[PDB]
Amino acid sequence: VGLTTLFWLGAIGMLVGTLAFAWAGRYYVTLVGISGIAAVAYVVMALGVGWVPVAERTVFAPRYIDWILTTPLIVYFLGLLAGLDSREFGIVITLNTVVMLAGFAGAMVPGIERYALFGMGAVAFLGLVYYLVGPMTESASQRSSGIKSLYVRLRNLTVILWAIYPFIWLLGPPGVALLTPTVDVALIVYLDLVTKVGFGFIALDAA
Numbered sequence: 001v002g003l004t005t006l007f008w009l010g011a012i013g014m015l016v017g018t019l020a021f022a023w024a025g026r027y028y029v030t031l032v033g034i035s036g037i038a039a040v041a042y043v044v045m046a047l048g049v050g051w052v053p054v055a056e057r058t059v060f061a062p063r064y065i066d067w068i069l070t071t072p073l074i075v076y077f078l079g080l081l082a083g084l085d086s087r088e089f090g091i092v093i094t095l096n097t098v099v100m101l102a103g104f105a106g107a108m109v110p111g112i113e114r115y116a117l118f119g120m121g122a123v124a125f126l127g128l129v130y131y132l133v134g135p136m137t138e139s140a141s142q143r144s145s146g147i148k149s150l151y152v153r154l155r156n157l158t159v160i161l162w163a164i165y166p167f168i169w170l171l172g173p174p175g176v177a178l179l180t181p182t183v184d185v186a187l188i189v190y191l192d193l194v195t196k197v198g199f200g201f202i203a204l205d206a207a
């Protein structure tokens with residue numbers, strides 16, 4: 001099982017999700033963007049494009065462009081469910097972008113300064129979790145019982161799984177380089193598929 005095989009698997013999974021969401025169908029267009037963008041990133045990586053050598057590790061640049069564009073769309077989807085005003089959107093999307101940019105920069109820096117960048121993303125992530133579990137949950141409470149229930153289920157899926165990524169990053173090549181690239185990639189392909197396509201199908205089921 002090679003890296004390219006794992007990338008192709010993620011590509012296929014994102015494509016199936018993309019077509020499913022497009023067929024079912026603001027919410028549906030967002031889900032198409034979430035999995036559609038990831039599909040492209042995985043194909044590019046499957047073709048061997050964007051594999052950037054950094055010191056002694058290999059960094060996958062399309063992954064971070066993907067995350068920077070798709071994760072704010074996931075937060076946007078959750079913000080619509082919760083009924084956020086256009087100002088609360090700005091805070092959480094700003095916090096999200098800090099996490100994503102810090103990870104991208106830390107991965108691309110060869111020296112230990114990269115752990116300083118990782119730490120900053122961790123701090124901003126804790127602030128993002130606070131807004132999901134607190135203010136956004138208060139806001140979602142004002143909606144119908146079914147919408148509130150859908151928000152809580154997507155929120156917990158999001159919080160629990162997103163919290164695993166920084167550990168995979170740190171244990172993988174970008175960090176202490178403990179986990180091997182193949183295992184590290186396999187774990188992230190699984191998480192990407194669940195936080196995007198699984199996320200989407202839970203929404204379809206409730207609709």
Ligand SMILES: *C/C=C(C)/C=C/C=C(C)/C=C/C1=C(C)CCCC1(C)C
Pocket residue numbers: 038067070071099100102103104118121122125162163165166169192195196
């Ligand atoms: C579809 C892709 C998803 C949901 C990716 C999520 C990625 C994260 C939640 C990554 C978080 C990170 C930290 C909290 C600190 C810095 C390193 C990151 C980017 C792995």
Ligand SMILES: [Cl-]
Pocket residue numbers: 058059060063107174
């Ligand atoms: Cl990476």
